[PDB]
Amino acid sequence: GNPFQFYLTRVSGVKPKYNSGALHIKDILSPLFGTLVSSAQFNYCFDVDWLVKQYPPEFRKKPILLVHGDKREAKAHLHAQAKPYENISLCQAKLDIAFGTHHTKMMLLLYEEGLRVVIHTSNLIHADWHQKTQGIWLSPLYPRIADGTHKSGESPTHFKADLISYLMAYNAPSLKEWIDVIHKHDLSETNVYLIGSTPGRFQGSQKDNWGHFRLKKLLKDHASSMPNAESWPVVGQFSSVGSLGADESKWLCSEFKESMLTLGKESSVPLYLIYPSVENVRTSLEGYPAGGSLPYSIQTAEKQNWLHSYFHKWSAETSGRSNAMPHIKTYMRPSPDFSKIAWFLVTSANLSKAAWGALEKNGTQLMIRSYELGVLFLPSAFGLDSFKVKQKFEPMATFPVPYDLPPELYGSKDRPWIWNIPYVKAPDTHGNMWVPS
Amino acid sequence: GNPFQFYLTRVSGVKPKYNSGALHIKDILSPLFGTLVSSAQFNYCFDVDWLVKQYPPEFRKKPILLVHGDKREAKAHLHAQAKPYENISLCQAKLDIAFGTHHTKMMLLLYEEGLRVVIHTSNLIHADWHQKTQGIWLSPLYPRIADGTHKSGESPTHFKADLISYLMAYNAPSLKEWIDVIHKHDLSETNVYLIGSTPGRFQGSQKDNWGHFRLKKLLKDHASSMPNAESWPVVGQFSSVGSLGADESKWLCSEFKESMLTLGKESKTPGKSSVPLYLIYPSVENVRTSLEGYPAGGSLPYSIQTAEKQNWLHSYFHKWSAETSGRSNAMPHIKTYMRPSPDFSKIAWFLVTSANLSKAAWGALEKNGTQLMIRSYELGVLFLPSAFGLDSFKVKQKFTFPVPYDLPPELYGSKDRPWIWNIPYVKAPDTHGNMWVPS
Helix, strand or coil: CCCCCCCEECCCCCCHHCCCCEEEHHHCCHHHHCEEEEEEECCCCCCCCHHHHHHHHHHHHHHHHEEECCCHHHHHHHHHCCCCCCCCEEECCCCCCCCECCCCCEEEECCCCEEEEEEECCCCCHHHHHHCCCEECCCCCCCCCCCCCCCCCCCCCCCHHHHHHHHHCCCCHHHHHHHHHCEECCCCCCCCCCEECCCEEEHHHHHHCCCCHHHHHHHHHHHHCCCCHCCCCCEEEEECCCCCCCCCCCHHHHHHHHHHCCHHHCCCEEEEEEEEEEHHHHCCCCCHHHHHHHCHHHHHHHHCCCCHHHCCCCCCCCCCCCCCEEEEEEEECCCCCCCCCEEEEEEECCCCCCHHHHCCCCEEEEEEEEEEEEEEHHHHHHHHCEEEEECCCCCEEEEECCCCCCCCCCCCCCCCCCCCCECCCCCCCCCCCCCCC | CCCCEEECCCCCCCCHHCCCCCCCCCHHHHHHHHHEEEEEEECCCCCHHHHHCCCCHHCCCCCCCEEEEHHHHHEEEEEEEEHHCCCEEEECCCCCCCCCCCCCCEEEEEEEECCCEEEEEECCCCCHHHHCCEEEEEEECCEEECCCCCCCCCCCCCCCHHHHHHCCCCCCCCHHHHHHHCCECCCCCCCCCEEEEECCCCCCCCHCCCCCHHHHHHHHHHHCCCCHHHHEEEEEEECCCCCCCCCCCCHHHHHHHHCCCCCCCCCCCCCCCCCCCEEEEEEHHHHCCCCCHHHHHCCCCCHHHHCCCHHHHHHHCCCCCHHHHHCCCCCCCCCEEEEEEECCCEEEEEEEHHHHHHHHHHHHCCCCCCCEECEEEEEEEECCCHHCCCCEEEEEECCCCCCCCCCCCEEEECCEECCCCCCCCCCCCCCCCEEEEEC
């Protein structure tokens, strides 16, 4: 495919040229990718019946570990979906902090010929792989380390150790088993950096292990500050928003933007936020129902209308997905004219303190409420100064940014999509209206 | 200012002005309507845990009788549902004729202050009171007759005797107690006529007791025919259709319509009356775009098997439209029949009932026209102008009787189709992004 191994999920309803190069979960699980032996699925929402049907008929009996964060009845409903399939084991990731969720979306694939790791943004339900823009990162096939031979199977980006450490934070029996599988493989070919979030209150050195502080550490040690960096804007594109505070200074343009604009170890930047407008959703491929996956509530919104002055429309003519609402979350540092970028991040983390972390105890502690995972593409990991933007989604140098640049600002009549209020004046693409609950 | 006491249930999602004046079951059971002592819930479908929670906390341990028609396994499931509640008793209505159902929906509420009767159209499950158009008739508060006193407690519409006869047809011990409670009350204020259906084969005097013959009888005796009567249409709106026969003359436009177009004790047909008949039933598109989406079709059980044998019927179908009550998207589970004037500005009578468009509900003539056979239990109330001192009712519209849907009714379009619950619909998604793939 490409050196970045960054793909979008297939979209039903767009021209075929826009899906050549796209992946469907069935393509990912294909036998062509190896002879499956075991696998693990980390996610938020699941549809086990559907999921099992995505695996090739021959691999359907191999063991499957579902790592989720459901509690109480939700947890029971899940066990219930799994009940029928005996090869399926579950793992409830602990969420010992109020209002945390296990949002991480990743696939661990054990093959006879090696190991593959997949980090993406889709829930494991039919609708997340149907008509939405989703991101996928495919690790290469990692070979098993010659049993009886000693060697670190580590890469310049420290991926192996960082993944093991991420899995370590769950502190679960079933993952300890996967940690041992990773230990036995050679992941030295990895060229992306792992950026994870785990629940907790981190002090000292640990402040740099997760969330936006982890992002900061990596941009500090592996990106370099260029001239007039001050004019290189920061772009944030997400599918949900949390309470950011009474004003920008409380968290967004304070600690969050601070981390996002870090570059190099030395030493007013434009911040563009891409979030679907009501219109974007109304005329999408799915219509208003697409909003079921853009959970910005009126309760949260009404308390921070200052934020919406930063909102930009979703537009992706470059990949032909202007009508496929985004569930992918991405963050990047484009140049002033947007022809290039200093770094690109695809992740499950939305715009909230729960996903990225918030400083407490007088900036001495970083509190994170949930699990998030993403991969960072740094030019230096590819032996480049910057990435040229592929304005049509020179191979080994042009990054496939899935949406259009520059971002278009919300019009004066535009409004952010808020999923829990009705939209009844204008019918959507399917002639329907939106009336929540 | 409603001498009719006719209400629609609250709909979650409509503008607040369309619920101001609507009732939720919690409203009907609240202390405001009386201090509950005990109640009887007549229905078809029950969700007991849900139902018990609809009663006010202080009234949840008062005796409750569930009158149903379930048999075998279904019956066992219901007993299991109620098992946890000591104050709940069950009465299995006998259904000795094949393919019958206990469809009647009524609440008998005994308070310290008196008695209230509630005849409505909703099943006792959450979904029926969530986003559907349902109808409710609220009886006045009937006071206890002084023990020492000797009064009939009867109304000009004979509602007391008629409700007692209805209950009597069950021949149930538990309903005999309720019959005695009704005997002790004064129901003389009642201004509506009771129209019930009860399983059986009726001949002679009993012939006019139920079904469409009961309606015919009331229309003949308490309604007056008018000039140009033949131009006053007949409207029927329902949520389910039964097998009516190979063509319209088998039952629909024969005995059913004949009953519905009856007016007065007179009789004039000689080259005159060929009254228009409008049938209102949700189209696939009505359902697709509904507040519930395709799931609403779960309560409009018209099967392809039944439908394919009577495509002639669909030429009479009209779409559901209810801008007047802000309910065009709240699928109908209410059933109604009425007789509007040629311009729909008035009606000669209005009926709200549990009865769908089926022989099972209204009865079918047998034995060379001498016997009326009914398979199910059904109940409704009839509103006649004469019972209100009027000559006709004015329709209360969108632009006087509160008709819940728009008039005149709109005919199905050439591409519209009647909602049939057991075939899939996959061309266009519903309000929730889903498709419909049956069984």
